[PDB]
């Protein structure tokens, strides 16, 4: 296909206000990238003489960018994509009370982020810069896009640019989850909640937003909200995209286990997350030795997933289950602390003394896991006649 035909198609799509065709002609998912005729070095004259600005600069930059990616010049590709996003945002804020060009943004925005990653990887291979150099600039550009999309308050909701909000937020989250900067997600999370379209977005963007917010809440020890979000993200996830469902389970399992819900063996085997299996078997049993062995054996996987320190908080649940087992076996409301000391020594915990047992029981009672009090003079934990160990859901 000659570049004249491509320019004519671009002009027809722009003049007809058809977002889908214009987005296709500028997105790298389209096969036209692979066309050798399309890739050219300096097609700026053709774009200038065919398309009015700022579309001319945007599409000339896109053509040189596809040439660069054909030559694998990812730094030049990222620079050209930044030029594309700037010119398109100018032409996008140009539109008044119309969001025909909303799909275009999506494609363009996505491409930028992807290129940024490769750019950073290139700078890792070249050794010039560190990791995340271009990702912050990518996040800045996407934040400008988000501001433009959220500024459209006067226009009617049918043709407002607010519909292009959540997608951009999701993109930002990805960057903010690759450079390990969670705090920057704080404004966006409220910005979505302020909008009245919090539930009117597409299913994919809503699911991605719920998953990211659930991850942030879990990392902030907000397991109730984290469960409320990740359950929705995992329930509404697309069946075809199994990788996303597994990634959501990776962060939903610790929250459910901390709140007292244990995954079945079938769920772990189905999604190939067998690494949790033994861990689960410990927590529901009160086996501290098994929990330590399973956390050490799968230490690398949990360290990579970033949930090792969240997983280690299951030791409190393991303590509660072990002490509940001791209470059930002894069948007495007034339990000598030496019984819990014996149980702890059975789990091969290093240098356990009665003082550590008292400390663990005091922490459990303070946290609400146990309803009782430890008489120190007699060294006896007196537990309640009714509801000695309340269910983990209420705690």
């Amino acid at each position: 296909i000659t570049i004249n035909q491509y320019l004519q198609q671009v002009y027809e799509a722009i003049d007809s206000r058809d977002g889908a065709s214009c987005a296709e002609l500028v997105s790298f998912k389209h096969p036209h990238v692979a066309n050798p005729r399309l890739q050219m070095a300096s097609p700026e004259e053709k774009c200038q003489q065919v398309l009015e600005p700022p579309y001319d600069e945007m599409f000339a930059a896109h053509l040189r960018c596809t040439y660069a990616v054909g030559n694998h010049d990812f730094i030049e590709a990222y620079k050209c994509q930044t030029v594309i996003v700037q010119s398109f945002l100018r032409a996008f804020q140009a539109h008044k009370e119309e969001n025909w060009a909303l799909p275009v943004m999506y494609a363009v925005a996505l491409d930028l982020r992807v290129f940024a990653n490769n750019a950073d990887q290139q700078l890792v291979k070249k050794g010039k810069s560190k990791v995340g150099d271009m990702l912050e600039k990518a996040a800045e550009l996407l934040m400008s896009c988000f501001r433009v999309c959220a500024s459209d308050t006067r226009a009617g909701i049918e043709d407002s640019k607010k519909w292009g909000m959540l997608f951009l937020v999701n993109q930002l989250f990805k960057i903010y989850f690759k450079i390990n900067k969670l705090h920057l997600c704080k404004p966006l999370i409220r910005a979505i909640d302020s909008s009245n379209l919090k539930d009117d977005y597409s299913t994919a963007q809503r699911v991605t937003y719920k998953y990211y917010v659930g991850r942030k809440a879990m990392f902030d020890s907000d397991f109730k909200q984290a469960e409320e979000y990740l359950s929705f993200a995992f329930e509404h996830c697309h069946r075809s995209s199994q990788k996303n469902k597994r990634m959501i389970l990776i962060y939903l399992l610790p929250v459910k286990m901390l709140l007292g819900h244990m995954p079945t063996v079938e769920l772990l085997k189905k999604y190939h997350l067998m690494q949790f299996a033994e861990v689960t078997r410990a927590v529901s049993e009160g086996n501290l030795l098994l929990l330590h062995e399973a956390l050490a054996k799968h230490e690398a996987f949990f360290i990579r997933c970033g949930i090792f320190l969240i997983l280690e908080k299951l030791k409190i649940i393991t303590y509660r289950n072990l002490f509940k087992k001791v209470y059930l076996l002894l069948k007495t409301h007034q339990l000598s602390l030496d019984a819990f000391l014996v149980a702890l020594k059975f789990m091969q915990v290093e240098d356990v003394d009665i003082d550590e047992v008292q400390c663990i029981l005091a922490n459990l009672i303070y946290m609400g896991h146990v309803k009782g009090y430890i008489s120190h003079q007699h060294q006896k934990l007196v537990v309640s006649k009714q509801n000695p160990f309340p269910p983990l859901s209420t705690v």
Partner: peptide, 5 residues
């Protein structure tokens, strides 16, 4: 001993 209340 008195029980927890």
């Amino acid at each position: 001993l008195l029980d927890y209340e």
